[PDB]
Amino acid sequence: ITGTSTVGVGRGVLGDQKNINTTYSTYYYLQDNTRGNGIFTYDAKYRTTLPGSLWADADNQFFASYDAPAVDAHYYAGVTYDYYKNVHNRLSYDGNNAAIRSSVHYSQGYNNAFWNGSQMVYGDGDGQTFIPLSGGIDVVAHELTHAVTDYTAGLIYQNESGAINEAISDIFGTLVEFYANKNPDWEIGEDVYTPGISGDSLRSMSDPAKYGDPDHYSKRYTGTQDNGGVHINSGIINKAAYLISQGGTHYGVSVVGIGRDKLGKIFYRALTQYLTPTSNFSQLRAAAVQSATDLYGSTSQEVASVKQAFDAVGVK
């Protein structure tokens, strides 16, 4: 909408108070004009029609329970923008300040959240398996990262290219969680998964096995469900990403970690300059190595760690 930029205040899903960029024209809208061509958050009103209606509020205060998922969807979309801009010099997901639009309250009891090719969509969860999923900054940054993948490598959402796609989203979602520096970790979704149970998550990057996902190529899922295990085989790449950053010994293979910034730089470069829609695991290895080579030289520690990490998970 046309109006003037202002700042509202509210509480997100986990009861935390934050300021949000809004726009005033009769009502206060969840429209942030300070980032790119804008960040826009909508109410799907428990239906599945999208995007629904631009979020409008009478007093610029967002403290109702109904408001909380919108507050976080909006705020975290902004933190993700900031991550990509400040860290990778990328402006929004298309690199040209594309508007970011999010819908919350999608359907009833919907235990998931997703980028749909045009915008972000967040269910409220059923209150047992999940609380409103925009409560999880890694969840938000994960799904927004599929937009970045759509506009760069274009990794097809199936089999190994699909698990790479997933892995990439897990990797930048986590790096965004670390950048926000709020109880960061290498698990995915812990802030909104199973409010009844402490310390679990959807999956783990540091030890995928913890939730049944493979941590070695030999343990790869080979069937046809989950689009050829895209959310399963990502464990293999996630493990590799984790070892490159934090290092470790895995199946008797030892990796010297080089830290999160370099991991980010190496995988951002691999994603935007070397991966393709049908890249497989082996190709990702060649892409991460070449990226590290571009960045630190063929005989650097960075390249050696990349080589060791993929060896440790069995990806030659």
Residues 6+ apart with CB under 8 A from 301: 256, 258
Residue nearer to Ca ion on the CB measure, 95 or 195 = 195
* CB closer to Ca ion out of 104 and 306: 104
302 annotated to bind ligand? no
Is residue 261 marked as binding?
no
Shortest separation between residue 185's beta carbon and Ca ion, angstroms: 4
Near Ca ion by CB under 5 A, which window of 87-95, 171-179, 207-215, 270-278?
A: 171-179
Q: Which CB, 178 or 274, lies closer to Ca ion?
A: 178
How remote is the C-alpha of 180 from its chain's centroid? 13
Minimum Å gap between C-beta 32 and Ca ion is 17
On the 0-12 / 13-18 / 19+ scale of CB atoms within 10 A, 34 is exposed
Between CA 294 and CA 287 the distance in angstroms is 10
Q: Which residues contact 188 (CB under 8 A, 6 or more apart)?
A: 138, 139, 142, 170, 173, 174, 201, 202, 203, 204, 205
What's the closest the beta carbon of residue 116 comes to Ca ion, in angstroms? 22
- Closest residue to Ca ion using C-beta atoms: 194
Q: Rule CB under 5 A: say whether 61 interacts with Ca ion.
A: yes
Tell me, rounded to whole angstroms, the distance of Cα 214 from its chain centroid.
20
Q: Residue type for 166, please? A: E
**Binding range to Ca ion, per CB under 5 A, among 76-84, 154-162, 194-202, 296-304:** 194-202
Within residues 280-309, the interface with Ca ion by CB under 5 A covers: none
The per-residue DSSP string of 79-111 comes to: HHHHHHHHHH---STTSS---EEEEES-SSS--
Asked if 197 touches Ca ion (CB under 5 A), the answer is: yes
Q: Which residues are catalytic?
A: 143, 231
Tokens representing 291 are 């990226």
Annotated binding-site members for Ca(2+): 57, 59, 61, 138, 177, 183, 185, 187, 190, 193-194, 197, 200
Binding site for Ca ion (CB under 5 A): 57, 59, 61, 138, 177, 183, 185, 187, 193-194, 197, 200
